[PDB]
Amino acid sequence: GVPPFQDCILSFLGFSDEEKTNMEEMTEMQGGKYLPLGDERCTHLVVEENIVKDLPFEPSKKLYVVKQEWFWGSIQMDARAGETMYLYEK
Amino acid sequence: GVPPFQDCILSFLGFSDEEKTNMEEMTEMQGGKYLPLGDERCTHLVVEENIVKDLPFEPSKKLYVVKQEWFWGSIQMDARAGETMYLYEKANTPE
Numbered sequence: 407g408v409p410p411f412q413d414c415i416l417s418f419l420g421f422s423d424e425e426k427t428n429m430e431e432m433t434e435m436q437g438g439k440y441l442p443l444g445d446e447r448c449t450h451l452v453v454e455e456n457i458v459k460d461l462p463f464e465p466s467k468k469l470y471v472v473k474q475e476w477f478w479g480s481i482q483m484d485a486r487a488g489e490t491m492y493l494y495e496k
Numbered sequence: 497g498v499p500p501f502q503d504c505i506l507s508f509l510g511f512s513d514e515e516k517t518n519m520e521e522m523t524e525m526q527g528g529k530y531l532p533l534g535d536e537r538c539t540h541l542v543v544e545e546n547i548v549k550d551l552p553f554e555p556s557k558k559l560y561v562v563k564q565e566w567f568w569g570s571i572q573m574d575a576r577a578g579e580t581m582y583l584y585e586k587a588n589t590p591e
Contacts, residue, residue, distance in 0.1 A: 457549065
């Protein structure tokens with residue numbers, strides 16, 4: 407079908423380099439792309455909300471800034487989860 | 497005299513990529529090296545304490561976890577600033 411991250415360009419904040427590498431590799435497995443934190447091309451920023459209290463750049467209007475659950479939830483469901491149910495706050 | 501980051505391997509948490517690459521370039525200009533976040537070989541982790549409130553890994557007993565002002569403070573001082581003076585709020589000093 408449509409892989410979970412088709413046409414998504416992800417980025418990550420709040421993860422160790424080992425964790426981020428794992429999530430980048432999983433992103434590609436699941437049909438998406440990834441770019442560095444703050445890249446204006448990104449469609450999504452996935453945050454470890456237990457670590458992050460603010461963002462180090464001003465998001466574009468298109469950017470979905472989502473809690474980690476959106477990422478692993480999309481993979482579990484084999485479908486892009488609705489971002490609006492998982493927005494990062496504060 | 498001695499470069500401010502001589503013998504230091506830095507790493508960064510709480511920065512955009514743009515900021516991180518600027519800091520990496522500056523680290524090398526000031527005589528240090530850098531490695532990825534959480535690498536056991538790092539001597540220092542520089543934290544943007546307004547962006548993060550915890551770390552995504554357990555530091556080694558040797559690691560200096562410092563707030564951002566240690567980095568820029570060192571450059572201004574033209575010397576390696578005190579890692580205890582600029583200790584990150586939720587770190588202890590090395591053991």
